[PDB]
Design a protein around this ligand. Structure first.
Ligand SMILES: [Mg+2]
Ligand SMILES: [Mg+2]
Ligand SMILES: [Mg+2]
Ligand SMILES: [Mg+2]
Lengths: 439, 122, 439, 441, 159
């Protein structure tokens, strides 16, 4: 119908969306695609006289292209173009409201997934973006030429604030750049946030003074209200520490954007955790792919973002890691990049890999993500038989051995086990880590 | 290519990038004060440089003031009188820095400052 | 006509203006002069009954004197007197609105230039003036008996904030008093202002601790809004650094005056850059001479002001440099001083010379401006074959050699090359600078 | 040399500048344009090792087109492209600093004029623009289908605040939409601003109650400092009045943007006066053409802007061109109207142009024809000079305007029939007849 | 107790010339007086804020002087920084900066500033731990003649 316009030339100011559409039986792709377009824009069930007070064509979403999905006889990618004027400047909230607010409940569809968005420069330039971004962060921390290393403190709940800070000091002093608050750790009966912030600050400053290297702890500012979130960031600011944390999907985009602005204004790095993402991004037929949530974070603002474990599909991960880090990313269907994306010098976000990784993963992780990444342990440090500081040292040594080998021209994919084995000869900490975890 | 040194060459503002001034050269700088109708005065200190110990708000520094040696030499017409007092300070305070300053009673301010003696060993 | 009053005795409270008037053919100087007077005051095309509710004579601008311009048969200087009551106290904005707001578009004129203003004491006493001024600045910085030395960091755009601060530290440590933000450097994608302020502060404090001398960097507070301008000054204040910068013509006088007040209240020096001045002050027949813009700055407030290169006309420069620095300046047509100017103890502004200068210029610059000046390099430090710190040392040595020679009674205009040559014998840094730049 | 790149294709994100370049004798046009490009961007008089820490090609202005100027000899139009990354978002101050901060002083040029700027959408979307703009203003004031009418109170200085407000009330009640503070009127010994604001408010509300039409007075908030400027807007807000005023060139762009934000935040219309514009925009060979200053105002923020007198001032097509740049969403390149670049405002609202300076009832047909409805026609002597006083003077103007609008709407040609339209209205309007005997056409 | 000074009169010196000096030259004279054994130096009653010595500049250099002399001698030092001003807002701005600098004592001319202002300042000083030195400029206009006016003991009780 009138919302399927296959001859439309997209404008350089349009927001474009690629939807994976699964229509009900009997519903051709073209009116499914047209329904997505009309339902996520100007479509309404009966005619109305106020339409004649404007030019509706100027606000129509249009489905301008449809292609089949490989391996499916009832799934299509439908491309939809939305005019720039639909969107409130600087608001990820309004961008999602306008595009995914209504159409996922349409009855003629069995399922619907948003795969990708083309964010035009005219729109992305209305956002702050990362408080600092990759390059500024490396300069502030004086850290170059290797992935950054972190550890999440466990048990997440259980410890007193003091015992919690003790574990942080021991991790940091052994060679990790950062320690982190579990996503669940906000403020709770046996560890109130302000107590935790004081002891973690003592730990950060003790470990930095001991090692000579800059240290941080991702202090979780996630809270029930905006007022509490900002109170937490304000105290971190008072303590002079370098980095805070936010759970951006459960706290939400309005709060995240507020926090990103506060962090820009006060020189704080912002570590973003993606709790609840798999509620939305797991199933191939319905929801939103994480690369959409990743672009939205880059716009709303964060300096780090959790990006997986890669220990999903390699090519898809590599795809949205480029979308997070790079200035210009060309369309590349093999890597899940449905649109060419130009960020016109908005800083990039450092991807963070976490979840069940130990020293034997270091070659693969270094090879996959390269230097601009955070490798985040949590079990792989606190599970070392000699304790946290040696566990940290084992991970730092393994990483630096991989970086040295890579820089020398050695292939990490083929020689990683040998690289690690050679380092075990002079690092008893690494040797010990290598016999507990096996491969 | 020579590298600018990072130690041992702390400075004392005007004329301190020149080789240390000889007695002849110092005399000529004092004569410039006298000809200008400016009043010479000596200051001295055991601490040579600016620092920030008691406050750090904009325009606040410690170590800008040194200690006055005697009084400004009002009506001095002979540069040698000034250089002689420099030797007197050196005598009483062997390990003090000494500088010559100059007062302009017309624009009502201090208008000159330059190093006369640095303790060697420093 | 009634606005040409050649018998008028100027009042000691009048603002006086000297206009270079180029009338259309057929327009005698007297009604051109009278038109300037009426058009920049009470003149209106038809009569109005409300005139009878007051005494218009009391608010009339008057042309009270006309003289021919040397070398011109169709150009005159017309002198106009404006009553004190026309002007809002403390507002350069209103002074320009009232005098140059309308008359430059008058059709009977081919061209019009404002050459000079006599600012009476009754009016200038309603202004703060420089936040500190020459004498206070020398006392605060503990710097006496020589021109001050600076360097503008280049490339203006290109560097990360960290790489920018690195260049500042190397310049400052070699013997410059200051480094400066390029006029274009405010806050931009690859170098956001707050990042730049942090790294430049690290650089200022490292170089000051290394040399023992007080150091500063002119941190540019110029911004899109008053709120942003002040946010930038507030952070400089927090960092405890000595000096900030403003582009007063492109930011504008209302903003500049606000910033000058903030700097007085918080002990910050204010470096003023004159970007866009040549749009207004270049052409001899139309616009405003820079000495007008210079007086206006002294009133609105600044501690330094860019004043040229003198490497224009010597006598005109010397003229407005006196108007900027001195308490009382007698009328002197050879030096472009059209009116005797009495500043009744308003502090003076330090003139800044910049633009393509190197060590061989040091004798001439020292001779022209004397001690109360800033000599600002930008190419002449960052272009030294041994890098920034040696380039700075070469400039500092050349300057101090010139000052020593001058104080000894030597003539800098005749002996400058010999003075510089003698210093090359013991300063390898200066020798190296002298073979790249040649004269 | 390296800054002249005639094969360069401009990016949709570039800021483009059109300069009228007058080189010194013996300086080739290509060198001049290259110099304009190098001196308004990266051009440094010696090489510096720090250039090796970056990629300067990325930040170079480029001169990509040069052409001779017909009417002259030794004048060229040079086009320069500037990358988006040079510019601070939302800052007209930085845009001017960057483009016109330095190059006008270059020795090898006799003269330089900036004629036009292509502001790309990617940059203009970082600016609020007008607090309200043309359409919102009409809706707020419930005024449609005609130019708005105003009068500047004169003498600018002389009056007590009370006598000033009296003159406002009498103008407004006679049929004007607005009265205005002269650009020189800020706060002064015999009329302090807060006193003026009180009496002008009394007059606005008295005239509004009497006529049934919404009235305003442009209360001048121009001041010596940002704090003073905002104190004045804040009291206007307290009084509940619709419109304040700023002199954006003499107060400056940093202050103007601050005020524009305040007016958006508090529902105030913002009338912009252009005092001092002719210091920089008069001469054909040097300075900045007004259309550049007009685009900058649209970006910084204003709801009205003074745009000339276009009658007996300047050339018609040039006025018509920058009026389109001020009002329209999309303006196609058109050198006959001084539009050097296609300009796309991507739904930034437009600014109402204001005509002033020496106009009376006999100009009404020509003014209506040239500017059309979306304009303010701003009188002074043409209201306050009526032989029966302010209210009949206002009525004469309002009658003349409505007779012109009626006739236009009926299909009559204002350019040829104007005097006849006016003379017909004189038959039933004694106020207009008396006006028409005093002024002539 | 605050100054740790017992068993003797305190000693001070008023800097002269009252007007003439740059703020820096003024602070120089303060340092030299204090270092020789005086407890305090003082701002002349006329010294508030004036063209050649603006108050905030004077406060910075006098603070440098107070802290240099205290560090040299080992004894607590102060300078009576004059907060007397044209308005309450300016008076308090001056006391607020003294508070920031951490110095022990400020000054007020209570008869020419007046009692409403003085009482305001006395409260600010209680709330912020500042000593308050009171100068009695203009008292002899009121308290000199035996037959008319008010005796200084009345003005003293009121203070
Ligand atoms: Mg977790
Ligand atoms: Mg520059
Ligand atoms: Mg006017
Ligand atoms: Mg006394």
């Amino acid at each position: 119908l009138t919302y399927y316009t296959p001859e439309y030339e997209t404008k350089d100011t349009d927001i474009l969306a690629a939807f994976r559409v699964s229509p009900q039986p009997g519903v051709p792709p073209e009116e499914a695609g047209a329904a997505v377009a009309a339902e996520s824009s100007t479509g309404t069930w009966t005619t109305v006289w106020t339409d004649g007070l404007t030019s509706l064509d100027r606000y129509k979403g249009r489905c301008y292209h449809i292609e089949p999905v490989a391996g499916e006889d009832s799934q299509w990618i439908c491309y939809v173009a939305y005019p720039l004027d639909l969107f409130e400047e600087g608001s990820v909230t309004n961008m999602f409201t306008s595009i995914v607010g209504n159409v996922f409940g349409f009855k003629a569809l069995r399922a619907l997934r948003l795969e990708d968005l083309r964010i035009p420069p005219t729109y992305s330039k209305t956002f702050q973006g990362p408080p600092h971004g990759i390059q500024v962060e490396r300069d502030k921390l004086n850290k170059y030429g290797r992935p950054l290393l972190g550890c999440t403190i466990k048990p997440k709940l259980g410890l007193s604030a003091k015992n919690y800070g003790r574990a942080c000091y021991e991790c940091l002093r052994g060679g990790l750049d950062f320690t982190k608050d579990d996503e669940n750790v906000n403020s709770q009966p046996f560890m109130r946030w302000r107590d935790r912030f004081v002891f973690c600050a003592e730990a950060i400053y003790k470990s930095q003074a001991e090692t000579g290297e800059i240290k941080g702890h991702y202090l979780n500012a996630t809270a029930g209200t905006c007022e509490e979130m900002i109170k937490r960031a304000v105290f971190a600011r008072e303590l002079g520490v370098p980095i805070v944390m936010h759970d951006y999907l459960t706290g939400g985009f309005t709060a995240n954007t507020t926090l990103a602005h506060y962090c820009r204004d006060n020189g704080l790095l912002l570590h973003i955790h993606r709790a609840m993402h798999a509620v939305i991004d797991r199933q191939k037929n319905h929801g939103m792919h994480f690369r959409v949530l990743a672009k939205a974070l880059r716009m709303s603002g964060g300096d780090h973002i959790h990006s997986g474990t890669v220990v999903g599909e390699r090519e898809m991960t590599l795809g949205f890691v480029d979308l997070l880090r790079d200035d210009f990313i060309e369309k590349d269907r093999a890597r899940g990049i449905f649109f060419t994306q130009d960020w016109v010098s908005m800083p990039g976000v450092i991807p963070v890999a976490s979840g069940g990784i130990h020293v034997w993963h270091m070659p693969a992780l270094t090879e996959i993500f390269g230097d601009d990444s955070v490798l985040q342990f949590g079990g792989g440090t606190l599970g070392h038989p000699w304790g946290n500081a040696p566990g940290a040292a084992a991970n730092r040594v393994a990483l630096e051995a991989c970086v040295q080998a890579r820089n020398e021209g050695r292939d990490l994919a083929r020689e990683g086990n040998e690289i690690i084995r050679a380092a075990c000869k002079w690092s008893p900490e690494l040797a010990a880590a290598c016999e507990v975890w096996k491969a | 290519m020579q590298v600018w040194p990072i130690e041992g060459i702390k400075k004392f503002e005007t004329l301190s990038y020149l080789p240390p001034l000889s007695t002849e050269a110092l005399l000529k700088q004092v004569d410039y004060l006298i000809r200008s109708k400016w009043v010479p005065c000596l200051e001295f200190s055991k601490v040579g440089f600016i620092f920030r110990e008691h406050n750090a708000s904009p325009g606040y520094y410690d170590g800008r003031y040194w200690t006055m040696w005697k009084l400004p030499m009002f009506g001095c017409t002979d540069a040698t009188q000034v250089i002689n007092e420099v030797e007197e300070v050196k005598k009483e305070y062997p390990d003090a820095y000494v500088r010559i300053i100059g007062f302009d009673n017309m624009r009502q301010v201090q208008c000159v400052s330059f190093i006369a003696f640095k303790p060697p060993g420093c």
